[PDB]
Amino acid sequence: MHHHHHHRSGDIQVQNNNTCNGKTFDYTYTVTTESELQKVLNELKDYIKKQGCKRSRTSITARTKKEAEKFAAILIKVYAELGYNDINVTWDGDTVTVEGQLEGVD
Question: How many domains would you assign to the chain?
Answer without folding.
Answer: 1
